Amino acid sequence: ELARACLHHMEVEFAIRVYRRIGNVGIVMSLEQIKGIEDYNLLAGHLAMFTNDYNLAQDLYLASSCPIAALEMRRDLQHWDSALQLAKHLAPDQIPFISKEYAIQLEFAGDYVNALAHYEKGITGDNKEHDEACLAGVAQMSIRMGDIRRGVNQALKHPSRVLKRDCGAILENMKQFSEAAQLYEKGLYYDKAASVYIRSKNWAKVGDLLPHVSSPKIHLQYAKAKEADGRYKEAVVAYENAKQWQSVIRIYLDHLNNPEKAVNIVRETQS
Amino acid sequence: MALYYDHQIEAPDAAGSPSFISWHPVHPFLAVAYISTTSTGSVDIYLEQGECVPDTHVERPFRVASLCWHPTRLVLAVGWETGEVTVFNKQDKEQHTMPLTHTADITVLRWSPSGNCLLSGDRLGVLLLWRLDQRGRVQGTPLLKHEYGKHLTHCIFRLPPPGEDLVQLAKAAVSGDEKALDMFNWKKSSSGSLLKMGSHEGLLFFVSLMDGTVHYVDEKGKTTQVVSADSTIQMLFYMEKREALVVVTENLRLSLYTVPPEGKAEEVMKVKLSGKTGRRADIALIEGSLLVMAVGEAALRFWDIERGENYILSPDEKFGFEKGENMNCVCYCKVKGLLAAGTDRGRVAMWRKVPDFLGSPGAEGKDRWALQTPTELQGNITQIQWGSRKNLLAVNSVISVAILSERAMSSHFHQQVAAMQVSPSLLNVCFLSTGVAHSLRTDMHISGVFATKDAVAVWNGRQVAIFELSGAAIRSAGTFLCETPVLAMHEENVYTVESNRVQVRTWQGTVKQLLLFSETEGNPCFLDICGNFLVVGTDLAHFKSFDLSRREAKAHCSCRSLAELVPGVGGIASLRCSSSGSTISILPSKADNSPDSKICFYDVEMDTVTVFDFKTGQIDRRETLSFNEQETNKSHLFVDEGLKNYVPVNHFWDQSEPRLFVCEAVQETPRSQPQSANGQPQDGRAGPAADVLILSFFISEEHGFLLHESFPRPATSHSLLGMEVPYYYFTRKPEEADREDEVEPGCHHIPQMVSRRPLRDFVGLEDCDKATRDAMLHFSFFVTIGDMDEAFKSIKLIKSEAVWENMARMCVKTQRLDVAKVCLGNMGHARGARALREAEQEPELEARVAVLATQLGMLEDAEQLYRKCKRHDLLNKFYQAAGRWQEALQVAEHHDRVHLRSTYHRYAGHLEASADCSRALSYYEKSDTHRFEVPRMLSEDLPSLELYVNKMKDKTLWRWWAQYLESQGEMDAALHYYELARDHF
Amino acid sequence: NAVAESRFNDAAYYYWMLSMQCLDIAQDPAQKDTMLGKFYHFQRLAELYHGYHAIHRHTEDPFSVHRPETLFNISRFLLHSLPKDTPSGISKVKILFTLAKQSKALGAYRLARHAYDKLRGLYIPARFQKSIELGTLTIRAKPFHDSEELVPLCYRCSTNNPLLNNLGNVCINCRQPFIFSASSYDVLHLVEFYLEEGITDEEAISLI
């Protein structure tokens, strides 16, 4: 009560003392940054922001020597319609950047239609890294909106390997295993790709990826699947890659009659 | 609590009153001696269920006088009232009679610790040492014969001395103990007792006589008198870790003697112990040093030999004991820290030690102990003993012998319902979604319980009873005869076990469906249900699982053998499954039936086992879809070296989250216990660690095993009962439930016997349910998986400012500032978002994360981060802002000397604001700003300023005071002070 | 630290020392323009804090070492010299309060009214607020003109300049920058001049 009253009556020195007594160090540090401000409207605006009255804070900032503080507060609060309206009057160059951060928030919130519109508005044509981050958002939102073609083609044409991972992840959440595995494959995430191809039961695609598959667990699932398919040659190389040496040992003995190859395995195991 | 199941032994109808009992020192088998009405003696061996072992019966026309099991082999020695000694071998089914050489009652019988020799002694004082083969047969003739001419009372072997406890030997010798020097000094041992560095015959021992004397015997068999007590010796022990003999007489006189290798004993102390003389006091020596006596009194008497301190433990009527109920016998389990005593009213009292587990925190005297609920039995209890490494106890009344097997009160939890067995015929049932508790008394000794949102099932191994919730009252829904060892439930379906089958039944016991096992798969003996899935486990360690989304239960997992999946496993100790049925978790047991440090997880879709071993921290993986005994894939992803001493004992899966799992693990104690040089609690010597750990895991096909949490089991909690988000479930101590609820006689006040603990990421968010539960479950999984974008996506439907605050607090630990900006925005924390944007002027991530920690009120983390950055400037500003000025000045004086004047100035300003002007002056002086700040501060109190100016004698201050006098027109005084200031101008 | 401890004469000296450091570092061609910018910036701060030290002493201390006309000149010089963003430790309230009180004392009664109306646009502390309530009445009471002897002459164009103006420390007629006595902040009867192309500094001295 005493603290809130000190903020409303603008007694910053008593507000500092009282929040220091309470042990709210965060508010002490922030008020110690404002203690030197003599502009009534700027000071009153910062204090209104600390009492969570954002509309009053905006009006006071606009009346102050520094209006840009209102845009910054609204951007910090992620109140994007108000931040865009302030940006149109005070800083037009920030509009594409604010539209990207708004499109990230709309992408998070589930409004994929407006997120896609705001990522397309966020394209500047000058800042390549920012435009790439907008095009990444367009690809991701085209995916979630069911234009999987537009979003996958964009993610393939785009220079980022991280976008290919993230589009692959969204597509696995959608159970779109083929396009998830394709974007992981084109992103050089060969293990993640192969694991999603195992979910799709595509032992042919996994077999093309196996020279790049690092995971023993993927080779082990493939070795089981190929033994069930009667492809003992493939299942052997896969159990060898998986370091499941005794399956290979039994196969070379019982099924292949090739025990010279059974012994070649044993020395690294000492089994 | 642990309830100890009373397996009354199946004594033959020809067996009379039991006389003595003896466990095998390792194996779960009990020898029992009987005296018939015709005074014939017999001996029988029993399994842990109290079943008599076939072909083990032994009888003679005269009484059993002594029993002694071999230390390691399945061999029993029996001594008889005639002087016959007989060795029985259970493995080979042979019995051998020793050469008739005694002519009187065998009062002493003891295996050597190597087990290669047996010692026998009679009432006439003839002592014989025998060598025996691996079958228990005598190799020729006695290695030793001696004739004391007096009744032999006790023998103990001196286990081959390595040199005391070697640190205690070294300290004793450095402190000038000439007998510790005689242990080190190799030239003086003319008897063949070198400090026994090898597989020596182990023929060093002490023997006592009824006159009160003790004789030592050396490796050559020479006898020397070591003690001469004033009465009959009631008990004898050897403190190996001190090379010291303890003697207790029937007049309750304790004496301790240090004994060198040569058998010339020297006395450490002699003390008259408290207690009633004229009864045979049973005595135990807990760990060495802690002497405990059951004198035939309403309390156990304790004497700490190393502190020279005494205390008592008495049974308390709050647990159901009677007033004045006397304890006749006492024994201690060293492995789990459990003290037991047998009463004249037929009860076993037990105290759990506040553990001397390898890191558990200690206590002094009586506070070393916590009284557990009684075990009630028939007739006056005359002897007890703790046995096999499972923590079994055996009990001998005037009427019968019982084997007591430890269980976690057979207890169960499912669907936010719990059932806790308060007594052999009483349950406390908690509907944890409503907070309501019910007391459910049964017409049977309950062997197990199972629970659901609608109904609870109980059984005794002859019948099953089922009870339905009917508003605010539990009512009997059915009761039927069924010999089931275990049971489970899903909706209106009951799952019961018979020979080679599981039977699905209605609540009235009507069989709906059969699930079949072959003789090679073994009998079912474990059941668990999670989500819509049943898992089943068998004797000789096979398992199966079934889908229950259909009334026809359907085979989800085909049969697997745990012994083929995991070599060296002796059995199953427990089974559970995931709420998807995709993963099964298994506690194996070793061939000696001890709990295994391994836990096994079987993937049903991949058809593979992953085995995690607590002793090594390794994860194995093995494959056998095709027949196999494979080499392990090995991953070193577990960094926690703290787990090496723990063993899993209970385990569970989340009923809603198939990726989420938990295990309880105990810190097991070694087979025999040492002591310290000082009188500390025996392993509680150091600072705290968990008596029992609770470990929770996320389990996935893409990332393997991830430790979600590790924590100590709460001090108010006796075991893990379950888990279902947001909560782990635990069994509460009735020792503590009565300490906050004030109660009066005349109402059956229901104790709150189930405690619950929130999961780490759910602390302060436990109101979470349904779709918010599923979102937070996905969040907790995805955060621990490290795929933070999926965690952040799972939260998108949650508007709660508290969830955004908890995620911001977790951004401080994960050092993820990008997500923290969005969290601060979603919570409306505009000052924190500004503070992070300004903190981007600092190049270090840790300094920026410290600003976030400061704005969230995490001051400890913030302090640690600023220290880690070496940013003593921001740390000083932080301390100032926290009002911790002394720490701020210390950091300024040692690491931030350039701000020290500014820090003194700011502190002086806060002291001035606090109306402490005197200390403000001292710090303005230290900041060298007293020339302008002091006159400003004291400008209202002119006399104090004048005193100050005259005290400092500073030139600049005399000029200022002269300017003040000059403006006031006091020119003669202004001149005086300008003359003092030497300001000639 | 000097600014935070209100040692504004030490702060002015240290800003001058910083400017001299920047000028030495500007001998490296890679940092020249950046460090020349810092040199002018810090010199401007050194002149601001050297002036504001007198205002701070006059407003904190009970008695003044500086003369009324010196504090009046400094207060006017500071209001013309200060950017849109105020430097740390500098107070526009102390400057306008010192201006209003010294303008009242010197007979700049219209300027004193204007300074008290400017103070009402600022967050005034309680000590100054009490004096400003009495000061506002007691000035509004006085005549509606300023003493002609206070009005600064431009020595380049012989024009009398209004006591505050929107262009700052330049003549309203010829836009000549004013040069001020660093003791008193009176305008100095100096005009700055520039050499014609192809004259060296050494040649200029040889001709002078």
SS (H, E, C) B934-954: HHHHCCCCHHHHHHHHHHHCC
The strands making up B381-386's β-sheet, listed across from edge to edge, are: B3-8, B401-407, B393-397, B381-386
The answer for C 55-94 residues in CB contact with B (under 8 A) is: 60-63, 65
Beta bridge partners of B3: B407
Residue keyed to tokens 């004391």: B148
> Which residues make Cβ contacts (< 8 Å) with residue B38, sequence separation at least 6?
none
* Distance in angstroms (rounded) separating the CA atoms of residues B966 and B945: 16
Burial class (CB in 10 A: 0-12, 13-18, 19+), B826: buried
DSSP line for B590-652: -TTSPBPSEEEEEETTTTEEEEEETTT--EEEEE-SSS--PPPEEE-----GGGGG-EEEEEE
- CB contacts of B881 in chain A (<8 Å) are 20, 25, 28-29, 32
Say whether B902 and C62 touch across the interface (CB within 8 A): no
**DSSP letter assigned to residue B432:** T
* Distance in angstroms (rounded) separating the CA atoms of residues B480 and B432: 28
Residue keyed to tokens 């010279």: A260
The one-letter code for the residue type at B647 is V
Residue keyed to tokens 């406890």: B165
Query: Could you give the 3-state DSSP secondary structure of residue A39?
Result: strand
Find the radius of gyration of the CA atoms of chain B: 37
| Nearest chain B CA: its distance from A76 CA (Å) | 6
Helix (H) or strand (E) holding B118: strand B117-122
**DSSP letter assigned to residue B52:** B
Find the radius of gyration of the CA atoms of chain C: 19
> Which residues make Cβ contacts (< 8 Å) with residue B17, sequence separation at least 6?
B34, B35, B398, B399
CA angle in degrees (0–180, nearest 5) for A229-A233-A239: 85
| Nearest chain A CA: its distance from C5 CA (Å) | 13
Q: Check: CB of residue B428 under 8 Å from CB of residue B422.
A: yes
Other CB atoms within a 10 A radius of the CB of residue A231 amount to 16
The two three-digit tokens of residue B586, written as one number: 């298994």
Q: Check: CB of residue B448 under 8 Å from CB of residue B458.
A: yes
The two three-digit tokens of residue A186, written as one number: 């084109």
Say whether A269 and B631 touch across the interface (CB within 8 A): yes
Q: Render the burial of B187-215: b for 16+ CB within 10 Å, e for the rest.
A: eebebebebbeeebebbbbbbbbbbbbbb
Residue B406 CA from chain centroid, whole number? 14
* Distance in angstroms (rounded) separating the CA atoms of residues B468 and B230: 68
* Distance in angstroms (rounded) separating the CA atoms of residues B310 and B302: 5
Residue keyed to tokens 């206590």: B363
* Residue spans of alpha helices (H) in B871-954: 872-881, 885-894, 900-913, 917-926, 930-937, 942-952
- CB contacts of C89 in chain A (<8 Å) are 36
Say whether B883 and A32 touch across the interface (CB within 8 A): no
Say whether C122 and A40 touch across the interface (CB within 8 A): yes
Q: Render the burial of C79-111: b for 16+ CB within 10 Å, e for the rest.
A: bebbeeebbebbbbbbbbbbbbbbbbebbbbbb
The two three-digit tokens of residue B219, written as one number: 């490796």
- CB contacts of B967 in chain C (<8 Å) are 62-63
Say whether B628 and A25 touch across the interface (CB within 8 A): no
Chain A contact for C93 (CB, 8 A cutoff):
yes
User: Closest residue of B to A21, CA-based?
Assistant: B883
* Distance in angstroms (rounded) separating the CA atoms of residues B694 and B665: 6
- CB contacts of B963 in chain C (<8 Å) are 63, 65
This entry's atomic model was obtained through cryo-EM
Strands (E), B452-553: 455-459, 463-470, 473-481, 487-490, 493-498, 501-505, 511-516, 524-530, 533-538, 542-547
Other CB atoms within a 10 A radius of the CB of residue B166 amount to 11
- CA distance readout (Å), B701 to A149, A238, B603: 29, 18, 9
Say whether B932 and C62 touch across the interface (CB within 8 A): no
Chain C contact for A92 (CB, 8 A cutoff):
no
> Which residues make Cβ contacts (< 8 Å) with residue B951, sequence separation at least 6?
none
| Nearest CB to C5; choose among B929, B963, B964 | B929
Q: Check: CB of residue B106 under 8 Å from CB of residue B118.
A: no
> Which residues make Cβ contacts (< 8 Å) with residue C118, sequence separation at least 6?
C96
Q: Look at phi and psi of residue B817 and say left if phi exceeds 0, alpha if psi is from -120 to 50, else beta.
A: alpha
- CA distance readout (Å), B521 to A218, B538, B560: 31, 7, 9
Q: Check: CB of residue B421 under 8 Å from CB of residue B3.
A: yes
* Distance in angstroms (rounded) separating the CA atoms of residues B165 and B432: 52
Residue keyed to tokens 């009057």: A89
Q: Check: CB of residue B502 under 8 Å from CB of residue B496.
A: yes
Beta bridge partners of B257: B245, B267
User: Closest residue of C to B965, CA-based?
Assistant: C63
| Nearest CB to A245; choose among B631, B882, B883 | B631
> Which residues make Cβ contacts (< 8 Å) with residue C197, sequence separation at least 6?
none
Nearest partner of B683 among B675, B691, B693, B671, judged by Cα = B675
- CA distance readout (Å), B769 to B418, B481, B619, B777, C99: 19, 40, 34, 10, 67
* Distance in angstroms (rounded) separating the CA atoms of residues A151 and B304: 78
* Distance in angstroms (rounded) separating the CA atoms of residues B558 and B565: 14
**DSSP letter assigned to residue B399:** S
* Distance in angstroms (rounded) separating the CA atoms of residues A171 and A182: 10
Chain A contact for B834 (CB, 8 A cutoff):
yes
Q: Check: CB of residue B65 under 8 Å from CB of residue B71.
A: no
Helix (H) or strand (E) holding B868: helix B859-869
Burial class (CB in 10 A: 0-12, 13-18, 19+), B887: middle
The strands making up B309-313's β-sheet, listed across from edge to edge, are: B282-286, B290-294, B300-304, B309-313
Chain C contact for B966 (CB, 8 A cutoff):
yes
- Kindly tell me the sign of the dihedral angle through the C-alpha atoms of B269, B275, B276, B278: negative
* Distance in angstroms (rounded) separating the CA atoms of residues A243 and A216: 7
- CA distance readout (Å), C113 to A10, C97, C130: 26, 11, 16
Farthest CA pair distance, chain C: 62
Q: Check: CB of residue C166 under 8 Å from CB of residue C175.
A: no
The two three-digit tokens of residue B880, written as one number: 């100032």
| Nearest chain B CA: its distance from C152 CA (Å) | 31
φ/ψ of B742, rounded to 5, equals -75, 125
* Distance in angstroms (rounded) separating the CA atoms of residues B602 and B582: 8
Length of chain A: 271
- Kindly tell me the sign of the dihedral angle through the C-alpha atoms of B822, B827, B830, B834: negative
- CA distance readout (Å), B793 to B319, B403, B519, B826: 52, 57, 51, 14
Contacts within 8 Å (CB) and 24+ apart, B460-467: B461/B485, B464/B494, B464/B496, B464/B509, B466/B494, B466/B507, B467/B440
End-to-end CA distance of chain A: 75
* Distance in angstroms (rounded) separating the CA atoms of residues A122 and A80: 13
| Nearest CB to A65; choose among C84, C89, C93 | C84
φ/ψ of B394, rounded to 5, equals -120, 145
Q: Check: CB of residue B596 under 8 Å from CB of residue B573.
A: yes
The one-letter code for the residue type at B114 is S
Chain A contact for B406 (CB, 8 A cutoff):
no
User: Closest residue of B to C61, CA-based?
Assistant: B936
Mutation site for C-interface testing, chosen from B899, B930, B932 by largest number of C Cβ within 10 Å: B932
**DSSP letter assigned to residue B322:** P
Query: Could you give the 3-state DSSP secondary structure of residue B526?
Result: strand
Q: Check: CB of residue B96 under 8 Å from CB of residue B137.
A: yes
Say whether B623 and A77 touch across the interface (CB within 8 A): no
Q: What is the 3-state secondary structure (H, E, C) of C166-196?
A: CCCCECCCCCCECCECCCCCCECCCCCCCCC
Question: What is the stated resolution of the deposited model, in angstroms?
Answer: 3.5
Q: Check: CB of residue A68 under 8 Å from CB of residue A91.
A: yes
The answer for B 255-274 residues in CB contact with A (under 8 A) is: none
| Nearest chain A CA: its distance from C51 CA (Å) | 19
| Nearest chain B CA: its distance from A51 CA (Å) | 10
Q: Render the burial of B585-624: b for 16+ CB within 10 Å, e for the rest.
A: bbbbbbeebbbbbbbbbbbbebbbbbbbbbeebbbbbbbb
